[PDB]
Curated annotation (Swiss-Prot), chain A:
Shown stretch of the complete protein: 604 to 1027 of 1447
Species this protein is from: Human immunodeficiency virus type 1 group M subtype B (isolate BH10)
Superkingdom of origin: Viruses
Residues annotated as binding Mg(2+) 1: 103, 178-179
Protein name: p51 RT
Effect of residue 383 to L: No effect on RT p66/p51 heterodimerization
Annotated consequence of substituting residue 178 to N: Strongly decreased RNA-directed and DNA-directed DNA polymerase activities. No effect on RNase H activity
Effect of residue 180 to I: 29% loss of DNA-directed DNA polymerase activity. 46% loss of RNA-directed DNA polymerase activity
Length: 409, 548
């Protein structure tokens, strides 16, 4: 079929991003993969008259998978291709009991790409020690990772999905990039059999899915702030308590700490046990009660990007908050991971970022920009090691450490 | 040339350059004709009709005061209008990453750009005109058939042309390694000298078949090779001789050049320091301003002169052997490292320095990051690390550190100085320890301040301070509490600045006050620092605020 014409935003040139140095292993894997893809027509070699560039990486299984970082090209295309060929996002996907993610990227490789647009998909397999200038390719078909691909394949996807949709009107199906999110209220067994039914349906219609991941968004909510519960209280405990409540006053108006402040009126030792008075305990009760309820007047803005902050709690635990404006949390949570002689900090952080990004997709239909607690170069070095996703969120690296660490715990 | 041309566009919405041709002297026009007739004779240029509406300035310049002149064309106005190309090679291969070959040959091609044809439809945009004397006769029109010198596209196009030309020979000779770089090729092989020279002559003949000349005689360059500030020797690599000038006066320019040479030399000469000399360069003022050399800078420079006395060399890479990198601390926040496969031979060396309160372990980790990046770039792998730090030390650090860190495979090497945790704050308040409620305050205008404390034992103190800030008083309060307390002390501050600086647990800073605080913290047995909201009348904190 003839290709769908693809235009850029007026005034915007193509992407020109540097290629990250790679291990010899990864470079060889990419050379192999691209040799096969060139052999199948999916990509071709290009000349020096093509100035554009898009980074490439190698991730994983026991088989190497190639991952293109199309973020820049996305900002330079999809921003007008979320308008023109945009995909609507269902608000009922987050309400379902079970959501399974299917990989439907392999579809895009069947469909050709607009001839005048291919030059923007340019990527470079690097060489070690700048020995050779690098192997240069561009895509001839719809590339995985580009947001224009599922937008162009949208109608085909609708057409293939319509029969299954008709046979299953209570199942929600939402396509984000190369992934198909399928949610239902069915029992886990019935759910998995249904997902398999969709797998066989898609397969007998010419769509392979290399799954031969389960979420539960009905349990997902903005977690309530927890005040310490103690039998006896020392001066230090009451100080941390008053401090934390005072911090919480930035979110919940109505928080008072006077009755708790009068309890430490004299200059006492930090280990001195202080009994709670009437006004004090009543104040703590009222504060706990007002803290148990969710925040008032907090709504999602479709015109604003999502911001995800993460902080490390130690002992294999991380806590995160998703917001758009300060102290207006759209979605907080706490990602914990079992060590099992496996995990380190970067592994946990990466898996956390992926979990958060997936939740964000399921809820709002788009991904947040992360403020990551990690050195920039360290992350840029090792983030591809535990990356199992096909998309890549925006991120930046936080400078100053949080003193608010124990306030999210 | 039978070489296939590369299609070139002008930038969208732009047309060819129409620029004035300003008159020249008679001799210049004569020489221009003398050269252009010979260029036309070789088909590199061609006369054109009056139809061509574009033009480009032409100048004539003597070559090093010699017989033959040189034609110079300013394409800067055309370069603005031509499309962007693939970006040419940014960096160059580092000798430490090269591998020993029994034979290495340098082949430089002449007229490299003029030996490669230019896209036909684009040739009309490179049109230029030779002026006539007194404008009594029409000017001589010309245009390029090949890659013009100083044109935006010539380097990348020549690069790809060369690569495509080399592809067949490369295919028929998989056991020889060709490196491409600008006008040069560098051919290495493990073939015996006779076979190698045969293959070299074979390559020369190929390139000549594609219209590319290359040295006919015994190749003009022999080892050692002076290449990009390097000395490349058959079994070792080093840098070209560094010259540290002797001057009574030093400007910003001279210091910049000096720091340049020292940095450049630091890749193979172990121990080079540049912190004190570049600390003079903190002043972003004029490049001609004379900067007085401090005593520390003088000592540093002298030590560098001592290091650079006897020459040192680096070896080449062996894929079959392990890759080891070892790190040592130099004291002033400076770090140095050696990357090697063998005990007495370095592949290369280097340094790391933290610019812009910090601690030794964090710096060490940063260095490990730098070396990891460099290793990946040069050899395509990550090295095994040898580090002066205990496992319990580093584990203790990375466990309670707020950022996520990647700690690689490493073994402990007991070589002083060692990296350790000099002090460690208590996680819980100390029973049987005095509690200093501290506070400090200053005036933004007068810069008059005061810092003090109030303790649960009834002890109180207020010390006056001149020429200070709110922050520095907030630190001074804590310092005071540390000074007047026992080996175990509970400090309570309302300042999240001070709390932030201290909880980071630094062992060094560019602030003397913080250094004194660190000294006190090391001298103490147990120190618990707690924080409370200011002006909330919690009590204990209120009296100290009232005092100061
Ligand atoms: N001018 C110039 C020039 C000459 C040789 C170079 C070189 O050379 C090499 C070229 C191909 C190759 F396979 C391996 C090389 O170097 C391995 C190390 N080495 C080096 C020099 C020598 O005499 N012997 C030797 O063993 C690699 C390189 F990046 C740049 C070079 C630039
Ligand atoms: Mg105060």
């Amino acid at each position: 079929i003839e290709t769908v014409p693809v235009k850029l935003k007026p005034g915007m040139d193509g992407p020109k991003v540097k290629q990250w140095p790679l291990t010899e292993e990864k470079i060889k894997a990419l050379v192999e993969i691209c040799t096969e893809m060139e052999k199948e027509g999916k990509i071709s070699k290009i000349g020096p008259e093509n100035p554009y560039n898009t980074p490439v990486f190698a991730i994983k299984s026991t088989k190497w998978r190639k991952l293109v970082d199309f973020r820049e090209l996305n900002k330079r295309t999809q921003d007008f291709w979320e308008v023109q060929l945009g995909i609507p996002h269902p608000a009922g996907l987050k309400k379902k009991k079970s959501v399974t993610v299917l990989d439907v990227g392999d579809a895009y490789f069947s469909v050709p790409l607009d001839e005048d647009f291919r030059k923007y998909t340019a990527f470079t397999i690097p060489s070690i020690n700048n020995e050779t200038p690098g192997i240069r390719y561009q895509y001839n078909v719809l590339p995985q990772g580009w947001k224009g691909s599922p937008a162009i394949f949208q109608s085909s996807m609708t057409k293939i999905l319509e029969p299954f949709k008709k046979q299953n009107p209570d199942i929600v199906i939402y396509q984000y990039m190369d992934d198909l999110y399928v949610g239902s209220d069915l029992e886990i067994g019935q759910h998995r059999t249904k997902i398999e039914e969709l797998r066989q349906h898609l397969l007998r219609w010419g769509l392979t899915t290399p799954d031969k991941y389960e979420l539960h968004p009905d349990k997902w909510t903005v977690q309530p702030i927890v005040l310490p519960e103690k039998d006896s209280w020392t001066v230090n405990d009451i100080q941390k308590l008053v401090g934390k409540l005072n911090w919480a006053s930035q979110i919940y108006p109505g928080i008072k700490v006077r009755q708790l402040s009068k309890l430490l009126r004299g200059t006492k030792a930090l280990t001195e046990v202080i009994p709670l008075t009437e006004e004090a305990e009543l104040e703590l009760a009222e504060n706990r009660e007002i803290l148990k309820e969710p925040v008032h007047g907090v709504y999602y803005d479709p015109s604003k990007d999502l911001i995800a902050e993460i902080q490390k709690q130690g002992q294999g635990q991380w806590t995160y908050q998703i917001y758009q404006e300060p102290f207006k949390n759209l979605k907080t949570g706490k990602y914990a991971r079992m060590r099992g002689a496996h995990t380190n900090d970067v592994k946990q952080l990466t898996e956390a970022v992926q979990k958060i990004t997936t939740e964000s997709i399921v809820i709002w239909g788009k991904t947040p920009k992360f403020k990551l607690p990690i050195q920039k170069e360290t992350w840029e070095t090792w983030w591809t090691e535990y990356w199992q996703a096909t998309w890549i969120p925006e991120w930046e690296f936080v400078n100053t450490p949080p003193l608010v660490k124990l306030w999210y715990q | 040339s039978p070489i296939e041309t590369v299609p070139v566009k002008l930038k969208p919405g732009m047309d060819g350059p129409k620029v004035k041709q300003w008159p020249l002297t008679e001799e210049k026009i004569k020489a221009l004709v003398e050269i252009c007739t010979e260029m036309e004779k070789e088909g590199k240029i061609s006369k054109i009709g009056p139809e061509n509406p574009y033009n480009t300035p032409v100048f004539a310049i003597k070559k090093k005061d010699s017989t033959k002149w040189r034609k110079l064309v300013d394409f800067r106005e055309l370069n603005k209008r031509t499309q962007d190309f693939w970006e040419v090679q940014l960096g160059i291969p580092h000798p430490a990453g090269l591998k020993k070959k029994k034979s290495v040959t340098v082949l430089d091609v002449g007229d490299a750009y003029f030996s490669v044809p230019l896209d036909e439809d684009f040739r009309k945009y490179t049109a230029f005109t030779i002026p006539s004397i007194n404008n009594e006769t029409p000017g001589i029109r010309y245009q390029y058939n090949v890659l013009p010198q100083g044109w935006k596209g010539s380097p990348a196009i020549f690069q790809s042309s060369m690569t495509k030309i080399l592809e067949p020979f490369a295919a028929q000779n998989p056991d020889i390694v060709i490196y491409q770089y600008m006008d040069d090729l560098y051919v290495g092989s493990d073939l015996e000298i006779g076979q190698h020279r045969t293959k070299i002559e074979e390559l020369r003949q190929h390139l000549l078949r594609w219209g590319l000349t290359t040295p006919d005689k015994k190749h003009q360059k022999e080892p050692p090779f002076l290449w990009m500030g390097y000395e490349l020797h058959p079994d070792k690599w080093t840098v070209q001789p560094i010259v540290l000038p002797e001057k009574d006066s030093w400007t910003v320019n001279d210091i910049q050049k000096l720091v340049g040479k020292l940095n450049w030399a630091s890749q193979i000469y172990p121990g080079i320091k540049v912190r004190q000399l570049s600390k003079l360069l903190r002043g972003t003022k004029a490049l001609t301003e004379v900067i007085p050399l401090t005593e520390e800078a003088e000592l540093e420079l002298a030590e560098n002169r001592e290091i650079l006395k006897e020459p040192v060399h680096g070896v080449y890479y062996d894929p079959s052997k392990d890759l080891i990198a070892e790190i040592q601390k130099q004291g002033q926040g400076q770090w140095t490292y050696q990357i090697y496969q063998e005990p007495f031979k370095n592949l290369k060396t280097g340094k790391y320095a933290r610019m812009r309160h910090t601690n030794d372990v964090k710096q060490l980790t940063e260095a490990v990051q730098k070396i990891t990046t460099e290793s990946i770039v040069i050899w395509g792998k990550t090295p095994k690390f040898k580090l002066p730090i205990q496992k319990e030390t580093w584990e203790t650090w990375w466990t309670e550190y707020w950022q996520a860190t990647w700690i690689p495979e490493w073994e402990f090497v007991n070589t002083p100085p060692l990296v350790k945790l000099w002090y460690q704050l208590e996680k819980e308040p100390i029973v049987g320890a005095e509690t200093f409620y501290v506070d400090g305050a200053a005036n933004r205008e007068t810069k008059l301040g005061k810092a003090g404390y109030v303790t649960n034992k009834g002890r109180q103190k207020v010390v006056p301070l001149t020429n200070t800030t709110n922050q520095k008083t907030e630190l001074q309060a804590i310092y005071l509490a540390l000074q007047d307390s026992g080996l175990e002390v509970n400090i309570v501050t309302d300042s999240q600045y001070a709390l932030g600086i201290i909880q980071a647990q630094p062992d060094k800073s560019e602030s003397e006050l913080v250094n004194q605080i660190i000294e006190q913290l090391i001298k103490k047995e147990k120190v618990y620092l707690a924080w409370v909201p200011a002006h909330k009348g919690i009590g204990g904190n209120e009296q100290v605020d009232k005092l100061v």
